[PDB]
Amino acid sequence: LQQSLELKRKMLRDKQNKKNSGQHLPIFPAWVYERPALIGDFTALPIGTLPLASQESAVVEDLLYVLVGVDGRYVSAQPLAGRQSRTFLVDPNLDLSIRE
Amino acid sequence: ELVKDVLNVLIGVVSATFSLCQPAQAFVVKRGV
């Protein structure tokens, strides 16, 4: 995240020294990268006490939200985002069959 | 009623099992004894 800021500038200096005929190569305002909303990704009943074919409707409902990048009540998007591999955490108490 | 499980056992499902394990010792299929 912070490490990326370097690469963008080092590459910028290379085209500035190479071409002085075209001046003031463009850059985007700082908030373009800083604002986390612009990029796509960012009362809870105990599911253990529920009947089976209701959990399926709930899990289906939460997944439908996860596909577009918005967190869900029973399934959370882990924020590590370490290296480049995104990971997700499903609620621990569910039916092993539905969970897999 | 139990058959509903069998239907999805054709697809992979966990009500029954194919434990990647030593035959019987940990390898298993859900059963009633």
d(CA A38, CA A41) in angstroms, rounded, equals: 9
Amino acid at site A67: L
> Which residue of chain B is at minimal alpha-carbon distance from A96?
B14
Chain A touched by B13 (CB under 8 Å): yes
Q: Which residue from B8, B12, B14 is facing A96, i.e. has the nearest CB?
A: B14
Nearest to A52 by CA among A20, A97, A17: A97
Query: Measured between CA atoms, how close is B1 to chain A, in angstroms?
Result: 14
By residue count, chain B amounts to: 33
In chain A, residues 70-99 whose CB comes closer than 8 Å to chain B: 96-97
State the method: cryo-EM
DSSP result, A77-98: E-S---TT---EEE-SSS-HHH
SS3 of A76, please?
Answer: strand
One-letter identity of residue A18: K
Are A99 and A86 a contacting pair, CB within 8 Å?
Answer: no
Instruction: Enumerate the residues of chain A whose CB falls inside 8 A of the CB of residue B8.
Output: 97
Residues in chain A: 100
Residue written as tokens 């590590």? A80
Cβ within 8 Å of residue B28, ≥6 positions away: B17, B19, B21
Own/partner contacts of A70-78, CB < 8 Å, gap of 24 or more, are: A70/A42, A71/A42, A73/A44, A74/A44, A74/A47, A77/A41
Q: Which residues, listed in sequence order, are joined to residue A88 by a DSSP beta bridge?
A: A77
Q: Helical H runs in chain A?
A: 4-18, 31-34, 52-67, 96-99
Query: What is the rounded CA–CA span in Å between residue A6 and residue B25?
Result: 56
Of A41, A24, A50, the residue nearest A76 (C-alpha): A41
Residue A13, φ and ψ in degrees, nearest 5: -60, -35
CB-based contacts of A62, cutoff 8 Å, min separation 6: A72, A73, A74, A75
CA-nearest of A34, A36, A74 to A54 is A74
Please identify which residue in the block is written with the tokens 């004894």.
B33
Choose from B13, B17, B30 for mutation: most chain A CBs within 10 A. B13
C-alpha–C-alpha distance, residues A24 and A57, integer Å: 55
Element (H, E) at A35: none
Cβ distance of A100 and B15 shorter than 8 Å: no
